[PDB]
Design a protein around this motif. Structure first.
Motif, mmCIF file in Angstrom:
data_model
loop_
_atom_site.group_PDB
_atom_site.id
_atom_site.type_symbol
_atom_site.label_atom_id
_atom_site.label_comp_id
_atom_site.label_asym_id
_atom_site.label_seq_id
_atom_site.Cartn_x
_atom_site.Cartn_y
_atom_site.Cartn_z
ATOM 1 N N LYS A 267 1.266 -1.105 6.587
ATOM 2 C CA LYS A 267 1.866 -0.253 5.540
ATOM 3 C C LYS A 267 0.944 0.901 5.139
ATOM 4 N N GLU A 268 0.532 1.691 6.129
ATOM 5 C CA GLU A 268 -0.401 2.822 5.935
ATOM 6 C C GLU A 268 -1.770 2.464 5.303
ATOM 7 N N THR A 269 -2.135 1.182 5.292
ATOM 8 C CA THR A 269 -3.488 0.790 4.865
ATOM 9 C C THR A 269 -4.489 0.974 5.998
ATOM 10 N N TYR A 270 -3.970 1.186 7.198
ATOM 11 C CA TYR A 270 -4.797 1.646 8.284
ATOM 12 C C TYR A 270 -4.158 2.886 8.891
ATOM 13 N N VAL A 271 -4.935 3.954 9.026
ATOM 14 C CA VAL A 271 -4.432 5.226 9.555
ATOM 15 C C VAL A 271 -5.442 5.824 10.529
ATOM 16 N N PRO B 88 -1.121 -1.874 -0.769
ATOM 17 C CA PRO B 88 -0.544 -0.717 -0.075
ATOM 18 C C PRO B 88 -0.155 0.355 -1.078
ATOM 19 N N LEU B 89 -0.425 1.610 -0.735
ATOM 20 C CA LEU B 89 -0.234 2.743 -1.645
ATOM 21 C C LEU B 89 1.234 3.032 -1.952
ATOM 22 N N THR C 262 -12.226 4.444 2.916
ATOM 23 C CA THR C 262 -13.385 4.748 3.739
ATOM 24 C C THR C 262 -12.907 5.177 5.123
ATOM 25 N N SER C 263 -13.703 5.970 5.825
ATOM 26 C CA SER C 263 -13.412 6.252 7.224
ATOM 27 C C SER C 263 -14.677 6.504 7.984
ATOM 28 N N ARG D 99 -10.754 7.150 11.609
ATOM 29 C CA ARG D 99 -10.034 5.907 11.491
ATOM 30 C C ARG D 99 -10.262 5.557 10.034
ATOM 31 N N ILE D 100 -9.181 5.403 9.273
ATOM 32 C CA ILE D 100 -9.272 5.330 7.822
ATOM 33 C C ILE D 100 -8.727 4.016 7.298
ATOM 34 N N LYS D 101 -9.453 3.436 6.352
ATOM 35 C CA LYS D 101 -9.037 2.192 5.715
ATOM 36 C C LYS D 101 -8.794 2.397 4.228
ATOM 37 N N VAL D 102 -7.662 1.892 3.734
ATOM 38 C CA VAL D 102 -7.489 1.736 2.296
ATOM 39 C C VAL D 102 -8.092 0.398 1.883
#
Length: 222
Positions: A201-205, A47-48, A24-25, A39-42
């Motif tokens: 770990k890129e779960t927030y970007v 973690p991907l 989502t963002s 602002r993006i959330k996995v």
């Protein structure tokens, strides 16, 4: 209706080499100056196991600065919005397809994205997480079937330097009827997409793009 400052929300779901995830963002930008931030959330799947960089372009065509008369096909599609679909072919074998729906519900832009990436080599910089962002890129857009098609080449920076190149083909479809759309000439968008922050770990970007459309400014002989 498409105002000088605009906000957006996005839901994303998909698969890259058998790995399921959702995103989502929310964000905001200036649709007329071509600037925007997400602002993006996995939220599922993290973690991907692959480089978040392959998703960056799946996350906004209303936010392109259209200048010299250049009919803005994406802004005109409103109130009813527009869709895009894309296949991105990586020179080392990976393929990502994305289909997106852009709508305007009660003052806010809603994006719905479905992703499917296959054939990414396990020893490649994407699956080994050795990527470092995109260089700037130019898209050429040309009218086809009362919609627009896009063509672009992009370069993803690698660890140790050098680049992994990929190629993008995109179909843009308006949901607003053609007699209400001044269709533009063959044109070009220059854009820069940068990562501003990451965490967990890129779960927030956090992602920022600037994009400006143009006709060709070069002297002609005809």
């Amino acid at each position: 209706l498409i105002t000088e400052n605009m906000h957006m929300k996005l839901y994303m779901e998909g698969t890259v080499n058998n790995h399921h995830f959702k995103c989502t963002s929310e964000g905001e930008g200036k649709p007329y100056e071509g600037t925007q931030t997400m602002r993006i959330k996995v939220v599922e799947g993290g973690p991907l196991p692959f480089a978040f960089d392959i998703l960056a372009t799946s996350f906004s065509k209303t936010f392109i600065n259209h200048t010299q008369g250049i009919p803005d096909f994406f802004k005109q599609s409103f109130p009813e919005g527009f869709t895009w679909e894309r296949v991105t072919t990586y020179e080392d074998g990976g393929v990502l397809t994305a289909t997106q729906d852009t709508s305007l519900q009660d003052g806010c832009l809603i994006y719905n994205v479905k992703i499917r990436g296959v054939n990414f080599p396990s020893n490649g910089p994407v699956m080994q997480k050795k990527t470092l962002g995109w260089e700037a890129s130019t898209e050429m857009l040309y009218p086809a079937d009362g919609g627009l098609e896009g063509r672009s080449d992009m370069a993803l920076k690698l660890v140790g330097g050098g680049h992994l190149i990929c190629n993008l083909k995109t179909t843009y479809r308006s949901k607003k009827p053609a007699k209400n759309l001044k269709m533009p000439g063959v044109y070009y968008v220059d854009r820069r997409l940068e990562r501003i922050k990451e965490a967990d770990k890129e779960t927030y970007v956090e992602q920022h793009e600037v994009a400006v459309a143009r006709y060709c400014d070069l002297p002609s002989k005809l």
